[PDB]
Amino acid sequence: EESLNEVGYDDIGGCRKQLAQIKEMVELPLRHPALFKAIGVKPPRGILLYGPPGTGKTLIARAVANETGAFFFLINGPEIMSKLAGESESNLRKAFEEAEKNAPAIIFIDELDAIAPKREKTHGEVERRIVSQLLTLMDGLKQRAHVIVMAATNRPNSIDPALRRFGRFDREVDIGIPDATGRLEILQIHTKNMKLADDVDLEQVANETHGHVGADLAALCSEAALQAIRKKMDLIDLEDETIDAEVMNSLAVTMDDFRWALSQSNPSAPRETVVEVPQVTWEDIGGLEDVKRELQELVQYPVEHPDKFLKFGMTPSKGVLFYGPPGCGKTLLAKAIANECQANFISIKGPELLTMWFGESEANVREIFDKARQAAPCVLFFDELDSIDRVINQILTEMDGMSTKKNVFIIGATNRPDIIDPAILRPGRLDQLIYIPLPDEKSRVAILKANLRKSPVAKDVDLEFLAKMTNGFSGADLTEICQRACKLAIRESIESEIIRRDHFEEAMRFARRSVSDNDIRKYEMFAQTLQ
Amino acid sequence: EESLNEVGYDDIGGCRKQLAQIKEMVELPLRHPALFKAIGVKPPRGILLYGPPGTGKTLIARAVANETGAFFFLINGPEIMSKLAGESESNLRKAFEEAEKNAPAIIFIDELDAIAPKREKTHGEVERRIVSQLLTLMDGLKQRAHVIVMAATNRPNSIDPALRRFGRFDREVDIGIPDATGRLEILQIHTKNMKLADDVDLEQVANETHGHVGADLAALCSEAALQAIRKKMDLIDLEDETIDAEVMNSLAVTMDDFRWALSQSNPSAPRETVVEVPQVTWEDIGGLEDVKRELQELVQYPVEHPDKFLKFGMTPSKGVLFYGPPGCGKTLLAKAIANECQANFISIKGPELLTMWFGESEANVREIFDKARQAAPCVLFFDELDSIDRVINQILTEMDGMSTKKNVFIIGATNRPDIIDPAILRPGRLDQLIYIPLPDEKSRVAILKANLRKSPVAKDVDLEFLAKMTNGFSGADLTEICQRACKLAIRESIESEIIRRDHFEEAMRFARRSVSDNDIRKYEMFAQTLQ
Ligand SMILES: Nc1ncnc2c1ncn2[C@@H]1O[C@H](COP(=O)(O)OP(=O)(O)O)[C@@H](O)[C@H]1O
């Protein structure tokens, strides 16, 4: 059989739901090669794995080929771009002929932007003789012995749009940035020949690596292995001997080796939108039980009974507006909305779409909307709605899709009642708003319990006895209160010559009181305009 | 053996920390060629030295090859750009085949922008046949006998972004402009065959050459050697004989020869962002002991106990805002903030980002933020925040990275309390500001002592007896007072026919009192709004 060093299904732990989607796409054509000759159903030829580079997209194709048992030729895009004019088309044709020779098989096109850009972009004519004959060999769809052309690209709007037409590249699956649990899985994978000691736990290590692709996670565990082996075998002065197995197994990576490898800069994945299914429940956001009661009607009630809600002749609401004071848990309530729906989270920000405004990147607005269309089920939180009217126009003209079966919930948060234009206020598009108020006693106490449970908590406080003077201290304001209280705890605790109730109670008798008291009536006139 | 005229490790003195980083990267692949065949760890193939030209990036690769004992091939980018179509790709392929022939070895690609630009930028199609096959021979990663491909470029956003993807060019180290201590080291290097006399001290020479690369420092010591040898050997009328080595050692470069060579123009490094580790202590900035107490909590307390501050579940604050009167040591307090943190200093200015605003160079804003990500540990002082809202948007959308392990401290200084927008003032991003006040009695006395110690000081003054009338005279204002007092010391001291207490005391009885007295309450109402 094949060697175990080849990649298997177990070796990938980035996005296993997308792995299941790829298996659901291509497993039946590949494991069952004759069934499509009997049925009159076209198999999906040409799925397209789009995502950031280094997400392991070659390993997906190699793993599904090696588990399935299909032959795996690889057309690297930069490999056939450097052959001379006419030789590159000839090599592409021989690659597809070799694919059709030992079929069933799968052939990969890594870095299709090197073959096909979105614009023509290249005023020489040998590029169009390369994307042409690739469009022709996309029409290997004769319901043959099955070949599936998996492809890779940096962005799905970076390829030529003639590829996205039907019959050429039909399915378009996002491999996606891995989540924190996927980071735990991939660090658990990347230890089998590294042979860590028991001190390294990798949980907080994976949690500290948010915003990075699987490639530089493999590079950071490799770098930690380099730091662990760099303390020895030259200091031991035994390079002259053979490479000793008991020395390597006696060596182990250490916790501060991982801290060292993380400490050097690894921004191989530039910062982008996030894909995550949160575990943050209703209770972790403080109070808001009437807001819970409305939002259960808004998202939990349609997904508990989609058949009964659709049977009553009305679609579910497209999304709620969060309207009220800024930073009062309204930003983190979308975690509970996604969690109790068991849906994914997208948290694209206001200044991000402002950068799309200033760079005229409304194509990126369309791309993140279609990204939300791809994620299923998911929620589309977006704060700072009053910051933008090109982006308001683009949001309104792209929200017209009616993917209520996708259960996308278009939730937006802003503080300005009517400075934001009433083009959103038209009924049927996005109008079932709610007034999120200032955090009250239960809200402040429960958000203090949640944000103080995650810290070392020597409380010794009745939280009503602490938060009674908070007339309108917001959740952002009270987490800043906890921030400066724990900073004074740092101030009195780290001073030494070489407990925490004191800092809560000096925050209780503190002289810094800053509450936006005048804005509750500013919300209340428009709330009474609702009446 | 190899000749001593070849470059060694001791020859380079520009950025020895980056030299240590390069050694940490490529020493174990090169000094230990067999160890990666047994371990399952990919060595970093293709580190990338980026910096201004003439920083010595060829000498780094030649030095690590010559000290390590690996073969050094050099693919000069302009050299293989001039061959005919298909011949250049053939030469690149034979160069990589020769690299794989006598491996372990290192190959260099100087001026990769001549090979690969950031845009496609060239509507001929032989350039993409040149950057392609370079991407293909980046995939010499078979964990072979190890070859590492060092690369050189002017700017890290000037190469093609397909090179920055993982597996092709992984490590991206800044070779960096040298500091003043590096200038001392490189002028100490450039004297071994020059044979200076004892009058030349080179310390003030190195201090006078801020803003210049190592190339024109070698050119200025060469020019000083030319000035020293240009007074003789034709004036002596002894060119006809053999070149006398005893006369050459009897010849010596002189102090005014260095002044002459510096006096002719050497702008080979155009003015850019600066990289420096200051030694300017807390005492060198006048007073501000309560601001010292806050800033010790802000930067010194996290770096004294990172484990205890992270163990309390709260990240360190991203950076304080200097809020108060302009030019009162707020520009130079970041020197102390970097100094007792033992961190690097970046002092990018407000009008510099205004030139990024007017030229729409937000890519340069991303590049200087990633430069701060590269520098470790460092601080990111940036004044004139009220000058800028595209750049405010870009700063906010790029400051969202959470490199608290890097100990980057996002400090900004401005005088306008609320004219600058509070989008930065949203909590958790950049909110723990402080009110830097006008310099008081201790502050003005200490800044006068520090700025007058560096001058020839015949003080004979009680500094309280001088600065009692300074109601609100700033540190910029009082250094201007010292400036005009020393200019009157010039006025009375150099007049002659062919001491300094008089000028301090006529500054004491001077008739120019210009203090912005009206703005202390303008700061004080917002400071009491903090309450
Ligand atoms: N989801 C994942 N599971 C396992 N390994 C991964 C994953 N993502 C990235 N990697 C690691 O990152 C590297 C990048 O994957 P590769 O497919 O070679 O590059 P690219 O994705 O750019 O084609 C691989 O060597 C792999 O070990």
Ligand SMILES: Nc1ncnc2c1ncn2[C@@H]1O[C@H](COP(=O)(O)OP(=O)(O)O)[C@@H](O)[C@H]1O
């Ligand atoms: N850090 C340094 N140490 C020693 N010499 C240097 C340093 N930086 C620059 N130089 C001098 O400057 C010149 C520029 O170096 P070189 O690598 O030849 O040019 P480039 O960096 O443009 O490829 C060299 O001749 C070298 O002598």
